[PDB]
């Protein structure tokens, strides 16, 4: 897995699906991210909990 690193995550994983304004997904989006880094939650309902971190897939 790993699929989490860098926010406040740090040796979570990616939770699939997980809620974001409502909608599910089942991947790392980079929405809500004016940086266009993809992320995902290690939870339910990201708003919240909060809990999330960038997935280190390609550089």
């Known amino acids: 897995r790993i699929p989490v690193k860098y926010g406040?995550?740090?040796?979570?994983?990616?939770?699939?699906?997980?809620?974001?304004?409502?909608?599910?997904?089942?991947?790392c989006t980079d929405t809500g991210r004016s940086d266009g880094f993809l992320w995902c939650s290690t939870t339910y309902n990201f708003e919240k909990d909060g809990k999330y971190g960038f997935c280190p897939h390609e550089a």
């Not at 406040?8 to 991947?27: M, T």
């Open 8 to 27: 406040n995550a740090d040796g979570e994983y990616c939770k699939f699906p997980f809620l974001f304004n409502g909608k599910e997904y089942n991947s």
